Design a binder for these strands. Structure first.
Lengths: 79, 177, 66, 95, 114
RNA sequence: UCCUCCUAAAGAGUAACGGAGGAGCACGAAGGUUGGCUAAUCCUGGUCGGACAUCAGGAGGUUAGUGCAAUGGCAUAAGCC
RNA sequence: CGACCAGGGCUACACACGUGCUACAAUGGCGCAUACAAAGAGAAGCGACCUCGCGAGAGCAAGCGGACCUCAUAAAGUGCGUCGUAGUCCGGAUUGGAGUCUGCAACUCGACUCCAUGAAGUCGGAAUCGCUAGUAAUCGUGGAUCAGAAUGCCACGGUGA
């Protein structure tokens, strides 16, 4: 619930998706940009969001679109 | 008697033309409807059963029979022959007027009413449901009552299997999914 | 039927909001004035709104427009 | 009486907390109704010192004991606290 | 005294009396009476049935009891099915919005068992 | 001291510091008659309600039940109103 | 063990303690109308008026390095109306949806607005604190730090034992 106009992505995630979608479904994309949204042309990819010491992969599903990449990668581990 | 007559000259045509019956008495007619209200809190309060015996006397149109405990189980602190429930069996015309009252004004006043369950059959064609509120009936005036309890309704038909009960109640436009 | 044990049971007229004046036999007071009945109760059409509800891409496409 | 251990440069191990707690409970039972107790453990390169503050109905009372191994300091502090408690107890009996 | 499924208070004024419906408060409850031509300080006994039926379809516009409860259950169960951070807090009973958890957190927690 | 079963050897009876269990009452209805009815235990469906309380249906056919031990009996019921 | 960058953490949570804010209501809640302050801040800043928006706010845009312009409507109070002692028209926590603003960027982790949701709480055991007069107790306002982010701190007045 922020950012009135346009979603947010970096150029190193937007150009990295638009590079690696037309180049076939490939290797999981290491990404450090947790703060970026999930566009509908990212559905079907295994992207590995960095949580601080890992790059945890999450398969992008259709419901995950309005959220951000860091939302599906927890940082602190409890028990 | 209204949807008794509707049974007399629509549902017989629907069921004979769907189920190609040889005899007319192969049709499933409904035999009775039994309204149970099993209390359980009678061992905590003996005169609380009288409040339950007044509800079915107003939901149904006749004085209900209190039902004793058959077995003496210690798991619910009862003994042989302690009154723990109340049934009322209505037949004849009282079940057709009660059926019209039910599916006409009393089922829709169940709040948050989705389509009614259709899995509820005994495998012989006898429907059984349970309603959680007394407030769904206009006789329960909601202002003089004390606790919200429920009851359960058993529609006992002469169906040979569950599918004939489905087609019978579906011929009465009983609500389902 | 037995006498002098059963409640009163009178044919009354129950009318609803959408206009279904119908006289059935019950044990209520003067007469009944309903709102909903077998008619004008959404168990026949107004039931399929909970299915055509979800999705997130369709929500997302009010923000791109390019 | 709840007791509240803290340590400046002294890593409070679980065996250390068990012993201190037992000693404090024993003292509390013996002398007076006690509401709360704060324990502070300090190490200053040589001196294993301990502070304690007891909140009792009359009020605060405090003691401090330096030792050699922490345990000794704790024992000294507890004996000092007991002595202080005897004084406070019949100080408010005084019939 | 029967709209949206329940609506049974009486001797109360109307805009306060409608707020026993799960889905309406004091703003939408004023929107119902201002949109249905009823003054706000009348009582439910003082309404005639020819007004109350015009309030039933009026409150049938905004989402009420059952649809709102299964809708909110669809929202929370949806988030818990995704397994995001928020739904991950919903699966465990801790504050979702990012409140303090070191000290208070106690409405979402409950009572204190130890 | 009394009751029931076995020992007890297919009539009865039959011993042991042989093997197992009970009684020293209860009921004016739990007796008499007349009228009526039929269980246990599982499965299915059913609001709280579960593994089991109450309702309906099916299987089943006395595997129950008898005021109290065990044996014999009981449907024509000796079983339940 | 120095230096640079990205992401995280400093915000974790079975629990324990301290300091505060809001309550538990009728000396009150809500709605309308209306009276009275002092102190202060402002140039990549304070931002009138006018339009749009329920609203946070947006667009245009004067003025002011200021006893002038702006922040900036003081609130408690007062008059009227209602609520009639209930978990209530108290309380406003939590959670869902929709937004706004700031900043590359509000997921971890900002503030605010709107709709909905409506928890504990019916004055607090043992123990404990402040306060002698414009004080206590309440009511609002401003500043610093600051892109944004006070229920804290530092100030100022109102009512006033």
């Amino acid at each position: 619930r922020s950012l009135k106009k346009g979603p947010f992505i970096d150029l190193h995630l937007l150009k990295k998706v638009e590079k690696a979608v037309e180049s076939g479904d490939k290797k999981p994309l290491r990404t450090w940009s947790r703060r970026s949204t999930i566009f509908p042309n990212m559905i079907g990819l295994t992207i590995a969001v960095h949580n601080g010491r890992q790059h945890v992969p999450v398969f992008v599903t259709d419901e995950m679109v309005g959220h951000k990449l860091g939302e599906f990668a927890p940082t602190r581990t409890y028990r | 008697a209204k949807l008794h007559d509707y049974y007399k000259d629509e549902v017989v045509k629907k069921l004979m033309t769907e189920f190609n019956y040889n005899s007319v008495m192969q049709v499933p007619r409904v035999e009775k409807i039994t309204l149970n209200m099993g209390v359980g809190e009678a061992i905590a309060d003996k005169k609380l059963l009288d409040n339950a015996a007044a509800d079915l006397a107003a939901i149904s149109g006749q004085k209900p029979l209190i039902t004793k405990a058959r077995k003496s189980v210690a798991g619910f602190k009862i003994r042989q022959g302690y009154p723990i429930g109340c049934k009322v069996t209505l037949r004849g015309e009282r079940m057709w007027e009660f059926f019209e009252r039910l599916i006409t004004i009393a089922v829709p006043r169940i709040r948050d009413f989705r389509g009614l369950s259709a899995k509820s059959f005994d495998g012989r064609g006898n429907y059984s449901m349970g309603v959680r509120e007394q407030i769904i009936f206009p006789e329960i005036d909601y202002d003089k009552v004390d606790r919200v309890r429920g009851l359960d309704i058993t529609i006992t038909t002469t169906a040979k299997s569950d599918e004939e009960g489905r087609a019978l109640l579906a011929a009465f436009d009983f609500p389902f999914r | 039927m037995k006498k002098d044990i059963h409640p009163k049971y009178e044919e009354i007229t129950a009318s609803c909001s959408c206009g279904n004046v119908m006289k059935i036999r019950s044990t209520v007071g003067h007469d009944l004035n309903l709102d909903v009945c077998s008619k004008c109760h959404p168990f026949f059409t107004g039931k399929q709104r909970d299915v055509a509800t979800g999705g997130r891409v369709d929500r997302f496409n009010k923000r791109f427009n390019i | 009486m709840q007791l509240n251990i803290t340590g400046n440069n002294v890593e409070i191990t679980e065996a250390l907390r068990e012993f201190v707690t037992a000693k404090f409970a024993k003292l509390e039972q013996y002398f007076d109704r006690i509401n709360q107790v704060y324990v502070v453990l300090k190490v200053e390169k040589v001196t294993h010192t301990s502070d304690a503050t007891l909140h009792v109905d009359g009020g605060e009372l405090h003691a401090s004991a330096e030792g050699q191994d922490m345990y000794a300091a704790i024992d000294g502090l507890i004996d000092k606290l007991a002595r202080q408690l005897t004084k406070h107890k019949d100080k408010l009996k005084q019939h | 005294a029967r709209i949206a499924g329940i609506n049974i208070p009486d001797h109360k004024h109307a805009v306060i009396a409608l707020t026993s419906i799960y889905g309406v408060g004091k703003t939408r409850s004023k929107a119902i009476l201002a949109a249905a031509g009823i003054a706000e300080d009348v009582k439910i006994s003082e309404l005639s049935e020819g007004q109350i039926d015009t309030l039933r379809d009026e409150v049938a516009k905004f989402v009420v009891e059952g649809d709102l409860r299964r809708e909110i259950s669809m929202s929370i169960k949806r988030l818990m099915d995704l397994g995001c951070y928020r739904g991950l807090r919903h699966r465990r009973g801790l504050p979702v919005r990012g409140q303090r958890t070191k000290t208070n957190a106690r409405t979402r927690k409950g009572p204190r068992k130890p």
